[PDB]
Design a protein around this ligand. Structure first.
Ligand SMILES: *[C@@H]1O[C@H](CO)[C@@H](O[C@@H]2O[C@H](CO)[C@@H](O[C@@H]3O[C@H](CO[C@H]4O[C@H](CO)[C@@H](O)[C@H](O)[C@@H]4O)[C@@H](O)[C@H](O[C@H]4O[C@H](CO)[C@@H](O)[C@H](O)[C@@H]4O[C@H]4O[C@H](CO)[C@@H](O)[C@H](O)[C@@H]4O[C@H]4O[C@H](CO)[C@@H](O)[C@H](O)[C@@H]4O)[C@@H]3O)[C@H](O)[C@H]2NC(C)=O)[C@H](O)[C@H]1NC(C)=O
Ligand code: CPL
Ligand code: CPL
Ligand code: CPL
Ligand code: CPL
Ligand code: PTY
Ligand code: 323
Ligand SMILES: *[C@@H]1O[C@H](CO)[C@@H](O[C@@H]2O[C@H](CO)[C@@H](O)[C@H](O)[C@H]2NC(C)=O)[C@H](O)[C@H]1NC(C)=O
Ligand SMILES: *[C@@H]1O[C@H](CO)[C@@H](O[C@@H]2O[C@H](CO)[C@@H](O)[C@H](O)[C@H]2NC(C)=O)[C@H](O)[C@H]1NC(C)=O
Ligand code: NAG
Ligand code: MN
Lengths: 149, 253, 65, 33, 113, 6, 85, 196, 438
């Protein structure tokens, strides 16, 4: 499972560049009698386009009765946009091979998601110029229709 | 002259500029038939790898993911597809697998005589790939030793072993009775031995007039051996092995 | 593409994808008839007639043509 | 629906009607002005 | 020894957010621009003569107020647009304001001239 | 004439 | 009740059309003409320059007649082109 | 306007917002909305897309009529409109079914040129503003707007060399340039190309 | 919930027919009244999975020609039959119970080649499952050329003999009630496409102004036959066709739809365009899909035609403005199984529905309004019946609708179009007499 860092899902909010997401996955072993938790430290997670953009070692965080869960802590999605695969490939010798994949689309930033003008100081200067011109134009029009020649 | 203008304009409009593209007048409905098959009998997330010319149409009608489209913003990607189609099946398989491709679509006009088939657009693919990778796809190898572009029994060994050639002329000679078929855009005879077997791809669809042909990448062997070996096993007739000879394999890590 | 309109041989030399599309090729004389019958001979005339009496509108049309 | 031949006839009929009306307009305009 | 051992970790390297100027400099320049606007508004009323002699009187005053109300009101719309309202609301508000304004402004201009 | 390879 | 409704349906007379579909195309080619004439007169009643009240009177009555004729024409033409209304 | 399609160029994807011209689609969508919500007839979107070019062919004929009516007379305008209506050269890229950018683009070109000539000979700010707005529409519709961007200046330049400068020219050109350029930098595809 | 009132099955004869794309059952039971109190009802027993998909349930008297009241009661689930007259304390009654189910057997070898015939596997209870003690029984499988049993039991009594094309299971003579510990898996031959329509959407548009009733059906079809082993080869298909392989096949090449008499303006399209291979004959509309539908393939298409309103709409006698309409429920290919049907009758804007009736039970009825090409007021009245399991030829009922369409509402459509044109013309008038010159 992969989700936003705040618990929001992917369907409620599709992923966007430079977002913070969490990946978790659980494992279990068969002793031949009961399923038990698999404590392994070599498991890794890869966010790939065609080549790994993120390779992160999963850390144990939260054990069930028969399974143990692993997680990559919050990480920031790349600034490159595209269709990225969320991959957990556990391939140890002697053990069963387990592969999990999930192709998701990481959008670019929309037009309304950039910082507004009133939050950048350089923009403060330019907004001031625009306002001074609009106000002076209104005063000009009133005076051009009032003042006789 | 004005009345002549009206007549000439109407005739020109009727004869030349009013032809649809999805349906060739005879009706030949191969394009839509193949695209609808791909839309109805394929997985919604599957990816189709064809030439750029037919990208938009697929997206509109097949409604499936495409590697390249008519808009050509990225030329390295188109070069990758061109390399994937002008190289031996092993290389094509590796490249296409690296991009999660499920199906490959080719246009073949040998039966009808379309003329807009992929084999009449192969020399362009070879050029574009040649630009990016000058040492692997060489245009001077798809010609004969005399400089001729042949698809006959006198084709280059590099031509006969390319993906596009082996995927377009498959099961073609066995169609025309007698054991020899005749093309109708290049006007050359293809015999059953001019076409080597495809060991990495399966045919899943072939339109009614053999104009669109859809192949599917086959999953790699469970035992982890090259698919050419699986093939040469399933083909080679049963016979006693030559002998038991120590294999030259190297050092186990 | 705009440079290619002046350096006619440029496309093939560098951009190999612009010189494969049929759309960007020169045209033989028949096509200027198949598309504008009768008008094609009568157009060069209209340009001269607009040139004998220059006005600003006519300067526009001449440059366009 | 309307057949192809009938469509051709309609196209040519509209074109001829258009050209004759334009010629009549030019004739009246030139004579009267 | 391919794909048999643990693999080195990869971490994406990000770019830098562009540097914004310190607020004191921006405040200084905003003050300069404000002073320039004030100097213009006073140059009109002082050195130059914006006479304000021919203020309209009679029924024409009503049309004058309507004209000024269209002139300021389109600007109010554009400011209500800069601050978040949608293009469709900004396109219907403009139509509503424009139609009576197109009548009253033309009427003021016809009477006065 | 269309956006296609010749 | 299925039995009651079924008996009522079978022991009843079949639908009879107001204007048969076959004849509706001719009615359209006639209605169009009338609308064209009346509307054209209405369009030529905004230049009379006789009296604003007279212009309003003429325009309103001509427009009303033209509107009724145009509505009928639209229904007949729709039905005759295969888009039934 | 903020659409990322992940079903084209599969590994990379395509940001359509800044790689598409949004004016043909916007016009078709507006016609669709108008027909189904106001006039009351809900035609399909495939039918509107198919019959888009035939509809604007008449608009192009009228625009040609006015543009010619600005160079000689109204009779020559009628002849020009008749010629353009059925001329095979225009018909080739505007047959019912053809839905590329040219369908509406070559209509806007004539409209823009009409307003420019009306603005240059008369000398009016309103017609130059109308020309600027239609030039914006062309910038938003087709990618061959650059032709206008280089034909309107050229005309003006020639008028300077032949000694025919006036004040009507100053007024018309400066108003067209200012409004048109500031408005054609609002399409995401164009960006800051007009100044660099 | 064993039924308290009791009966005794003197003879229980069961015949299952497998010659179609569905299962039809006919149970001929003679019941005696164990209880001394007069009994009036009988309960039939179904399993859970079989009761989930039972399309048609009927019961009738062997001697009489009348259909006894029969319902499905909603883990041996039950159906209740109701006798017209009270049955005496000790007396015998003979019924023929007929059921049609929406299940067919799965192919025993899942993958077969284009030419090979298909064998299907069906699993059912061999021993009579009933709520009343049974003193004699039989089970006979008919309708297929070859019947064999998968994993036959050891016991000789639990075995089948073949007479002609039947597979009789032999007369047992002592059966406890509620005894279902036996399972029978039988493989039978089949050489026909198993046509399943996942969803059908029927639109029936009534127009008073033009006396035409228009039908438009959207089909989502799938063949449930054996999947193609080794993939699809055009070469093999063409070789079959050229050698005049006119035998039976398990793939769909042509579909023969049966339409109401007098149909006109036929059309057959799909989501990609108009298919051209569509021959319309006399009351038959032959349709050829773009690609032959093999085992496990999906094809979604739309067919449509037009008829005359005089054939479906009748006028009430007491009032000239009340109408009764009888509309068919299914007009599809000869042998097909439907899994969901949504029948929508669109009525003119004025109509006000007054009475509704359906011969087969429905899963939902809804009334709403949907706009149309010249709907400038509210829209056509849309009455929607949702149904679940329907069979091609069993479900031949006709929906009956009674609605009121007054003459005031007939003339309002021209008036609304006229009001729109009138307002436009008044707007032009205002725009023309309002000077805005500075
Ligand atoms: C059009 O389509 C084409 C094809 O479809 C697209 O082209 C592809 O683009 C890819 C990325 O843009 C590119 O992949 C990169 O290639 C680089 C060069 O590869 C060649 O050289 C290397 C040796 O240098 C060979 O090993 C290789 O086989 C080639 O011969 C690689 O260097 C790139 O690797 C880096 O990125 C990948 C993916 O993130 C990582 O897995 C890898 O480990 C490298 O990561 C380093 O850099 C990233 C930032 O990019 C860091 O985040 C990371 O931590 C690493 O940083 C260390 O190293 C850097 C220096 O590299 C150092 O500064 C830093 O401090 C750290 O020390 C990657 O493999 C494809 O090759 C290319 N394909 C083709 C056919 O051209 C094209 O994009 C499309 N056009 C578009 C989209 O507009
Ligand atoms: C914002 C205002 C716009 C200005 C317009 C003015 C206002 C009045 C409104 C419309 C009046 C006429 C509109 C009818 C056109 C629809 C016909 C259609 O679409 O027909 C198409 C195809 O055509 C035809 O068959 C013949 C083509 C003839 C069309 C005539 C063209 C005249 C008008 C051209 C432009 C019209 C603009 C509308 C779309 C942009 C429907 O084919 P189909 O396969 O869907 O169904 C086919 C039927 N089966 C279901 C059985 C398969
Ligand atoms: C006498 C006074 C008259 C005033 C002057 C009027 C006209 C001047 C014309 C120039 C306009 C310049 C740019 C306008 C941007 C509008 C888009 C928009 O609005 O999209 C914007 C941004 O998308 C874009 O950049 C899109 C690029 C422009 C695309 C335009 C569509 C092309 C079609 C052209 C013709 C359409 C005709 C249709 C039928 C005929 C988002 O808007 P929002 O909803 O997030 O707004 C919220 C308010 N924020 C701004 C504070 C967040
Ligand atoms: C303002 C001046 C306008 C002047 C117009 C002049 C000439 C028009 C000439 C030809 C256009 C029609 C020719 C094609 C006919 C077949 C189209 C077709 O077959 O397509 C139709 C849809 O298309 C249309 O809506 C065509 C609209 C026809 C309009 C006819 C013209 C008279 C009205 C003029 C405008 C009045 C506006 C008043 C507003 C208050 C396919 O519908 P469907 O797939 O749902 O099939 C139906 C299946 N159910 C019914 C079961 C769902
Ligand atoms: C500035 C204005 C623009 C000037 C003109 C613009 C465009 C027109 C030019 C070309 C259009 C090409 C015609 C192709 C149409 C194909 C369909 C076809 O031809 O249908 C023909 C029918 O024809 C006709 O009976 C013509 C009907 C006569 C109509 C009278 C004039 C039309 C009035 C329209 C506007 C009225 C509104 C008034 C107020 C707004 C065959 O159809 P079907 O056998 O499938 O009928 C289906 C089977 N039933 C018969 C059972 C339904
Ligand atoms: C690209 C160019 C395509 C447009 C075609 C060029 C049209 C030239 C217009 C000049 C017309 C002309 O005759 O100029 C005369 C004098 O102008 C002058 O005094 C000289 C005008 C100089 C303009 C010449 C055009 C330069 C560009 C052509 C070649 C450039 C080559 C670059 C590749 C006017 O005559 P008038 O008598 O009516 O005026 C009143 C004097 N009494
Ligand atoms: C663009 O590359 C191009 C446009 C039009 C034509 C063309 C025809 C194309 C398809 C046709 N059908 C399948 C009906 C017919 C065509 O007729 C033509 C006739 C001429 N003449 C009379 C000189 C010219 C072109 C076409 C082509 C093409 O195939 O040549 C190409
Ligand atoms: C064509 O109809 C089929 C049959 O209903 C549709 O198949 C269903 O598709 C959805 C989503 O893809 C799946 O969840 C269902 O399981 C499918 N049902 C079956 C029986 O396979 C199919 O989606 C339709 N195709 C189109 C293009 O509309
Ligand atoms: C039967 O009626 C309809 C059948 O469509 C269903 O109820 C409606 O379902 C639609 C489907 O989107 C919802 O939008 C509505 O809110 C539902 N209610 C109404 C009143 O329309 C449902 O299947 C059944 N409703 C019942 C039994 O009340
Ligand atoms: C989980 O917690 C630890 C392992 O981390 C250990 O007590 C046991 O395996 C688990 N205990 C419970 C209560 O789940
Ligand atoms: Mn284009």
């Amino acid at each position: 499972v992969h989700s936003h860092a705040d618990g929001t899902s992917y369907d409620e909010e599709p992923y966007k560049i430079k977002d913070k997401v969490i990946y978790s996955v659980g494992f279990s072993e068969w002793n031949g009698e009961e399923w038990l938790p698999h404590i392994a430290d070599d498991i890794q997670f890869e966010l790939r386009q065609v080549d790994p953009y993120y390779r992160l070692t999963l850390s144990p965080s939260g054990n069930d009765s028969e399974t143990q869960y692993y997680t990559t802590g919050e990480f920031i999605l790349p600034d490159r946009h595209g269709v990225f695969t969320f991959l957990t490939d556990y391939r140890k010798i002697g053990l069963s091979f387990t592969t999990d994949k999930d192709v998701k689309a990481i959008r670019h930033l929309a037009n309304d998601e950039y910082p507004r003008s009133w939050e950048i100081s350089n923009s403060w200067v330019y907004i001031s110029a625009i306002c001074g011109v609009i106000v002076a134009w209104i005063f000009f029009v009133v005076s051009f229709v009032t003042t006789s020649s | 002259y004005l009345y002549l203008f009206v007549f000439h304009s109407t005739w020109v409009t009727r004869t030349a500029y009013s032809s649809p593209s999805v349906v060739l007048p005879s009706l030949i409905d191969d394009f839509r038939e193949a695209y609808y098959w791909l839309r109805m009998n394929s997985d919604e997330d599957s990816k189709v790898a064809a030439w750029w010319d037919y990208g938009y149409q697929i997206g509109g009608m097949a409604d499936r993911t495409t590697l390249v489209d008519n808009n050509t913003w990225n030329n390295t990607h188109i070069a990758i597809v061109g390399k994937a189609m002008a190289s031996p099946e092993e290389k094509s398989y590796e490249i296409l697998k690296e991009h999660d491709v499920d199906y490959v679509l080719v246009i073949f006009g040998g039966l009808i005589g379309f003329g807009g088939d992929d084999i009449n657009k192969f020399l362009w693919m070879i050029r574009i790939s040649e630009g990016i990778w000058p040492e692997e796809i060489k245009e001077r190898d798809f010609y004969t030793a005399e400089g001729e572009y042949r698809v006959d029994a006198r084709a280059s060994e590099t031509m006969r072993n390319s993906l596009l050639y082996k995927m377009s002329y498959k099961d073609f000679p066995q169609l025309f009775n007698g054991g020899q078929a005749t093309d109708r855009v290049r006007q050359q005879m293809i015999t059953p031995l001019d076409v080597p077997p495809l060991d990495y791809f399966d045919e899943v669809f072939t339109s009614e007039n053999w104009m669109v042909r859809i192949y599917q990448l086959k999953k790699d062997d469970a035992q982890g051996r090259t698919l050419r070996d699986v093939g040469e096993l399933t083909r080679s007739s049963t016979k006693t092995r030559r002998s038991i000879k120590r294999p030259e394999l190297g050092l186990r890590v | 593409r705009f440079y290619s309109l002046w350096d006619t041989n440029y496309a093939k030399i560098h951009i190999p994808i612009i010189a494969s599309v049929s759309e960007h090729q020169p045209v033989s004389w028949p096509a200027f008839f198949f598309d504008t019958h009768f008008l094609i001979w009568l157009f060069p005339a209209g340009v001269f007639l607009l040139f004998l009496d220059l006005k600003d509108e006519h300067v526009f049309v001449i440059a366009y043509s | 629906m309307i057949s192809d031949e009938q469509l051709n006839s309609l196209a040519i009929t509209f074109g001829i009607v258009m050209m004759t009306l334009i010629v009549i307009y030019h004739a009246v305009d030139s004579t009267m002005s | 020894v391919d794909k048999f051992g643990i693999k080195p970790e990869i971490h994406h390297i990000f770019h830098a957010e562009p540097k914004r100027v310190a607020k004191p400099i921006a405040v200084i320049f905003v003050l300069i621009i404000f002073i320039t606007i004030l100097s213009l508004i006073v140059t009109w009323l002082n050195s130059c003569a914006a006479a304000f002699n021919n203020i309209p009187t009679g029924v024409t005053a009503v049309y004058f107020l309507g004209f000024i109300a269209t002139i300021v009101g389109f600007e109010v719309i554009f400011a209500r647009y800069y601050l978040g309202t949608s293009i469709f609301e900004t396109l219907f508000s403009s139509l509503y304001l424009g139609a009576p304004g197109l009548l009253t402004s033309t009427k003021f201009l016809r009477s006065f001239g | 004439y269309a956006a296609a390879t010749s | 009740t299925y039995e009651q409704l079924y008996k009522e349906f079978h022991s009843s007379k079949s639908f009879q059309p107001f204007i048969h579909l076959d004849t509706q195309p001719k009615f359209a080619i006639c209605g169009l003409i009338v609308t064209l004439a009346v509307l054209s007169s209405a369009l030529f009643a905004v230049g009379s320059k006789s009296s604003y009240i007279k212009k309003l009177f003429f325009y309103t009555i001509l427009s009303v007649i033209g509107s009724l004729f145009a509505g009928l024409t639209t229904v007949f033409a729709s039905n005759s082109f295969g888009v039934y209304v | 306007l903020n659409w990322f399609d992940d079903r084209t160029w599969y590994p990379l994807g395509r940001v359509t917002g800044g790689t598409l011209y949004p004016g043909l689609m916007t016009t078709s969508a507006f016609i669709w909305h108008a027909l189904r919500n106001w006039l009351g007839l809900p035609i399909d979107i495939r039918n509107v897309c198919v019959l888009f070019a035939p509809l604007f062919s008449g608009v192009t004929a009228w625009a040609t009529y006015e543009f010619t009516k600005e160079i000689k007379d109204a009779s020559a305008g009628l002849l020009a409109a008749g010629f353009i209506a059925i001329v095979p050269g225009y018909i080739s890229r505007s047959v019912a079914g053809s839905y590329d950018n040219e369908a509406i683009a070559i209509t806007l070109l004539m409209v823009t040129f009409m307003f420019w000539i009306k603005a240059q000979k008369t000398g009016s700010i309103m017609h130059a503003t109308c020309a600027a707005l239609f030039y914006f529409y062309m910038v938003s519709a087709w990618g061959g707007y650059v032709f206008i961007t280089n034909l309107i200046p050229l005309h003006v330049f020639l008028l300077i060399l032949m000694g025919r400068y006036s004040s009507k020219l100053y007024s018309a050109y400066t108003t067209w340039y200012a409004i048109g350029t500031v408005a054609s930098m609002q399409i995401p595809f164009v960006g800051f190309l007009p100044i660099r | 919930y064993e039924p308290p009132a009791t009966w005794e099955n003197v003879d229980y004869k069961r015949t299952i027919d497998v010659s179609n794309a569905y299962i039809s059952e006919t149970i001929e039971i003679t019941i005696k009244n164990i209880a001394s109190e007069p009994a009036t009802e009988y309960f039939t027993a179904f399993e859970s999975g079989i009761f989930s998909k039972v399309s048609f349930f009927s019961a009738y008297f062997t001697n009489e020609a009348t259909f006894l009241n029969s319902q499905l009661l909603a883990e041996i689930r039950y159906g209740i039959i109701q006798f017209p007259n009270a049955i005496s304390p000790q007396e015998e009654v003979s019924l023929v119970i007929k059921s049609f189910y929406n299940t067919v057997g799965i192919p025993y070898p899942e993958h077969v080649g284009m030419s090979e015939e298909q064998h299907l596997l069906w699993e059912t209870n061999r021993l009579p499952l009933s709520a009343y003690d049974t003193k004699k029984a039989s089970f006979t499988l008919i309708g297929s050329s070859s019947f064999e049993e998968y994993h036959p039991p050891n016991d000789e009594s639990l075995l089948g003999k073949a007479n002609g094309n039947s597979f009789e299971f032999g007369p047992w003579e002592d059966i406890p009630r509620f005894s279902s510990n036996e399972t029978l898996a039988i493989v039978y031959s089949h050489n026909a496409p198993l046509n399943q329509v996942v969803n059908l959407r029927r639109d029936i548009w009534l127009s008073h102004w033009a006396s035409t009733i228009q039908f438009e059906e959207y089909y989502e079809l799938t063949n449930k036959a054996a999947k193609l082993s080794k993939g699809f080869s055009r070469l093999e298909l063409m070789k079959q066709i050229q050698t005049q392989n006119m035998r039976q096949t398990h793939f769909v090449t042509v579909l023969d739809m049966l339409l109401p008499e007098g149909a006109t303006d036929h059309y057959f399209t799909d989501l990609v365009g108009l298919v051209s291979t569509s021959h319309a004959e006399r009351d038959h509309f032959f349709i050829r899909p773009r690609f032959p539908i093999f085992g496990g393939w999906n094809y979604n298409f739309t067919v449509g035609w037009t008829n005359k309103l005089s054939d479906f709409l009748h006028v009430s006698s007491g009032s000239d403005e009340k109408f009764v309409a009888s509309i068919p429920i299914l007009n599809g290919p000869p042998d097909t199984v439907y899994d969901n049907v949504e029948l929508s009758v669109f009525l003119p804007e004025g109509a006000e529905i007054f009475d509704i009736d359906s011969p087969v039970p429905f899963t939902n009825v809804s009334i709403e309004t949907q706009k149309s090409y010249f709907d400038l007021n509210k829209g056509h009245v849309k009455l929607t019946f949702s149904y679940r399991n329907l069979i091609s030829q069993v479900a031949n009922g006709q929906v009956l609708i009674k609605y009121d369409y007054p003459k005031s509402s007939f003339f309002k459509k021209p008036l609304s179009i006229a009001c729109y044109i009138f307002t436009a013309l008044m707007g032009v008038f205002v725009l023309k007499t309002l000077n805005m010159n500075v």
